[PDB]
Design a protein around this ligand. Structure first.
Ligand SMILES: NS(=O)(=O)c1cc(C(=O)NCCO)c(S(=O)(=O)c2ccccc2)cc1Cl
Ligand SMILES: NS(=O)(=O)c1cc(C(=O)NCCO)c(S(=O)(=O)c2ccccc2)cc1Cl
Ligand SMILES: [Zn+2]
Ligand SMILES: [Zn+2]
Lengths: 261, 261
């Protein structure tokens, strides 16, 4: 086990998962001074993201996040390798401190953060195999702020109620996953980093979209308060909140940007 | 051993020092969501802070910071108990990133940070004993920004060149430690936390002053370049830079303020 609080929290991960105390750790502060424009960062293409509404996709409370299993026919086109989707999941704070994005922008958190996890399918059969290999994974990260209601996000959040406890699964009818991405996906930050959860392998190509999406206060409240990270029968039940990693030191490394201003 | 970089860096401290992986860790990011004004918080009085120029105080490179020993006749008044001084020391960044404060405000680092450590001498015979009990230590934190030349801070800094390596020591004649504190000490943040270094005991009552002080670019540079974490005879020397801990999860704490925000 590992958690985001108490003795088994993030400061303790490295005991059993050595990479968590290694180099190239994510997430990081994306700040003006370490940004470098890279004109060679072209727009990524999202292939096969339009999932059939006739098909069901598995949503799970895994005790660390809520995760939607995704088919490997979704892929990113534009990186050195083909990266095929495995799942998406989210990171959030709590109603007292609703700023639980992993990445920060010039020191500031967003409300929450979505991650679409893909694996190098040119070389590996799955994320688990890819996860300890150089450039084995690629994550799209979407920063989330409070604003207008988001129907597309609600295609997930309307199901939170059915995955209240660790181990529970629901079906989510397919929708266009691209609807979850912000405007101007052409604008992004790019850096080499790590899984933000154990085993924290430094094997992830990060793309964080420059622009956040908005969800409503009620939506955010629901994400923050719907789930427990414990099995239903657990004698000490725990709310699933603050399930984000503190930002990591990122020394004399650059973050590349697809935009110059 | 422990450091701020590499295999023995902060994500690894918990491997040797259980409390670093525990609750109530410092430092923290000061921001509006987790602040509560408390009208009950009155100004501190700084007693015996004007050290005699005819007495000498030991300055040591301990490998983690430069520390000045302080006499127990130096004490703060205004807490529930007498807190007597034990030592002061600093945390800083590096020439390429001169923002190494430990506490942050709205996610922003200040250039550096001074800690003045005291122990509850009313209850405990010494700092080590105090450090195992709740509220056993009280630390005053002064945030340091690049600014005007500061003659008071030079009373420390002018001695850096004699404590270049771990274990090296020098005598500093007493001066007024009050001169190292900011404007309007009446305004501060107050919260329960931990040593920011191993062994990270959660036994510190923290006061961070609202107002920063200033030292010059030349003084900041001297601090960031004069010192080594290693003994002079170490086969692999290491500059003493970036000796600050990342900010820490709140663990349901509030921070109380003596001013309204
Ligand atoms: N946060 S993240 O850096 O995007 C990220 C989070 C998770 C994740 O879900 N971890 C469990 C928490 O939901 C995963 S993973 O595919 O479940 C995975 C876990 C362990 C070993 C190999 C692979 C991959 C990434 Cl890249
Ligand atoms: N950073 S801090 O939270 O102000 C802080 C830093 C240090 C410290 O010097 N650590 C070594 C390097 O800075 C100390 S201590 O006097 O060495 C100490 C250690 C163990 C038991 C009792 C006392 C106490 C505090 Cl409160
Ligand atoms: Zn994630
Ligand atoms: Zn300190």
């Amino acid at each position: 086990k590992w958690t985001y609080f108490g003795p088994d929290g993030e400061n303790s991960w490295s005991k059993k998962y050595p990479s968590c105390g290694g180099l190239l750790q994510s997430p990081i502060d994306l700040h003006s001074d370490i940004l470098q424009y890279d004109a060679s960062l072209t727009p990524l293409e999202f292939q096969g993201y339009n999932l059939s509404a006739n098909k069901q996709f598995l949503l799970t409370n895994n005790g660390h996040s809520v995760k939607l299993n995704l088919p490997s026919d979704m892929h990113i086109q534009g990186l050195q390798s083909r990266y095929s989707a495995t799942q998406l999941h989210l990171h959030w704070g709590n109603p007292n401190d609703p700023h639980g994005s992993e990445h920060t922008v010039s020191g500031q958190h967003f409300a929450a953060e979505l991650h679409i996890v893909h694996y190098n399918s040119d070389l590996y059969p799955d994320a688990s195999t890819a996860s300890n290999k150089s450039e084995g994974l690629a994550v799209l990260a979407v920063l989330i702020e409070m604003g207008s209601f988001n129907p597309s996000y609600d295609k997930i959040f309307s199901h939170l109620q059915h995955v209240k406890y660790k181990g529970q699964e629901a079906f989510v009818p397919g929708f266009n996953i691209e609807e979850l991405l912000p405007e101007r996906t052409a604008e992004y930050y790019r850096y080499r980093g790590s899984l933000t959860t154990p085993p924290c392998n430094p094997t992830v190509l990060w793309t964080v979209f420059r622009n956040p999406v908005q969800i409503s206060q009620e939506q955010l409240l629901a994400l923050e308060t719907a789930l427990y990270c414990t099995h239903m029968d657990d004698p000490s039940p725990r709310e699933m909140i603050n399930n984000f990693r503190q930002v990591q030191k990122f020394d004399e490394r650059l973050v590349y940007t697809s935009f110059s201003q």
